[PDB]
Amino acid sequence: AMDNVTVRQGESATLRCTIDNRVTRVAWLNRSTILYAGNDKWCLDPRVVLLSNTQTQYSIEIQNVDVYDEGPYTCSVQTDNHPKTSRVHLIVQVSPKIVEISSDISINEGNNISLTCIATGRPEPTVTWRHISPKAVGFVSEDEYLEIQGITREQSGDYECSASNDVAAPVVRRVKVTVNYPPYISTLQCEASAVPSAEFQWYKKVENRPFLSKLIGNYTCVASNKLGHTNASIML
């Protein structure tokens, strides 16, 4: 005749037991074991402290509760006509915690990559992957295990893992992915995009910005990185 009780890990749980009329003796039990009988402290664990022994209600408190303390707890009352008992289930909760994620990586285009996010908590959290890359389309997925086949430069960016249960606010940790792709070329200027940023070469001074180079007959622009090389020519 009493509502379930639920507390977070490392908190205090109060187990109350309302009484009426007159009762000879009252007790609290942890499964079969006895915790308190009247004002007699059976179990010697200091976390269990008696709170109220007035006839109106009999209540104890469990401090610094762990998940192992979850289970049924009965308030064994004894009355002359019939003996009554009231069972109460203690439910412990653990905030979600991301135990493992893949470390930050840089990868060549067109390879197989994989991302994982192992999270713990009580109850089991719901893990989701989000593509956090700005200035690009994103996506959310309900797969803990995330695989990418034939990775493209369009898929570079951060990947945020989120593990959530109703116990606490979801916890997030992200991983930045940078995708390596050979350069593609786009007074005299030569625009190109590459990861890592490509060093330009001009062939028959010159200021080299990170995203483009400029030069102040027919000449060719050569853009190159560790993966490959491209040449583009322009005539003035």
Add this chain to the structure above:
Amino acid sequence: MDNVTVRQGESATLRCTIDNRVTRVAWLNRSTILYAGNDKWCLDPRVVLLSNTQTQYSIEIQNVDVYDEGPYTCSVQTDNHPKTSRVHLIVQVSPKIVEISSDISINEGNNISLTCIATGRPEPTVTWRHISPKAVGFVSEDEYLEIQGITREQSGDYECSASNDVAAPVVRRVKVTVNYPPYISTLQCEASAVPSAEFQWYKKVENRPFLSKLINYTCVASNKLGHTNASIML
């Protein structure tokens, strides 16, 4: 894995071995506490303290009923580790035959069927016995007994026997009578019939039920099922 079993209306002894020293010990009936040390929690007098020594704590449950069946735990409190000892109490009821088939009369070569439903703890063993002398043996080891093409040789009482090994088995019998047309075997003709046939001579006189006596002629015995005549000439 401790276990105890007692018959209804008897006394059951619940022992609990302990070692070293325990602050307080108890015996429990499911969730409720019966005794804690020398403190009598439950108000039922049937649970009496037997041993309050430190080495062992034992109680006894007298006048046990079927409602007293269930688990009983010996809640110990020790500093090093907490131990509990559960014991399952098992109550027993002598077998009781709730239902049997009523007596029947049947024509020879007909179908009959008999049942003997018995209850008890533990499960009783029901057996059917044909009480006709020179019998073969038990006829069914189940509640249900059926006979196909019943013969006059199978008429008689059928004893059901239910035993659960708790107490002496209870038995009840049912008589079946098989109807058969008469068959014949100064002038006497012996014959057998169910119902018993009255003899007639055709062509005083004392006619016993199982044979007739006369003080070309035929002796006629007949009943509700059929008729036969056997003739002899002097």
